[PDB]
Amino acid sequence: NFRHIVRVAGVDIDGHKQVRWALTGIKGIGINFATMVLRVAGIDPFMKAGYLTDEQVKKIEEILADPVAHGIPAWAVNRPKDYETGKDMHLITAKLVMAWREDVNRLRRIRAYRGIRHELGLPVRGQRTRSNFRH
């Protein structure tokens, strides 16, 4: 009843560790969101990973597919108010990078300050660069 390597969506997580921390190997899930998801599913977040049933994995995958329908307020998700749909969503390993890339690319396209700074590889928000930020 122990799986040394469990296969959650896309990612292989450790078994010897607790679930709330094993789920952090995925890109887009922190400890807090993992605790939220496990509490919504009805799983002990202190249980050793690998003691996970196919039913449990499936429920976790469905919640990740769409958490807001299973609870998960719209203020605890990485991408509230999507640019082209609204429809508060939570992106993971594959779509998160594409979202970052398309945001930066539309900035570069409209030729805005932040996009020019991204191109040049320089600080973007407000920093001073005389004494620090040296490679």
Partner: protein, 149 residues
Amino acid sequence: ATVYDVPGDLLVERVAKALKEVPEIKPPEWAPFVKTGRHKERLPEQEDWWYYRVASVFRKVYIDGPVGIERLRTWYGGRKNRGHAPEHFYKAGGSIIRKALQQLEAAGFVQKVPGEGRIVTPKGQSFLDKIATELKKELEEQIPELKKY
């Protein structure tokens, strides 16, 4: 035989274990996914933290009442990690405290004074005193120096 005659941690434990029968005291919808103040980083690890918080608020109203919801915020606040900036003190959130106090009032353990916070009733005073009596009866065997009190 009173609250002042036993430690606070053991008493909060034994009161959280007992506040579960009271049906007017239950966690709200947004409880399982929330932090206790900005000065924290991670959520509570215990799955029954609501009752512990309610018991602590109950005992605090007993001790220091009349007290409203801005000094309990100070008591429950703490020290935040601000990254590369130095550490500072910040207060906690008020919704937890409001809900706890309203539940306690609904159960009939506290009441509000017109202009000075809230106080415990005799019904609640009896609760604390009896739980403390049981705890002291259990303790005064481990430490016989408590019998004379």
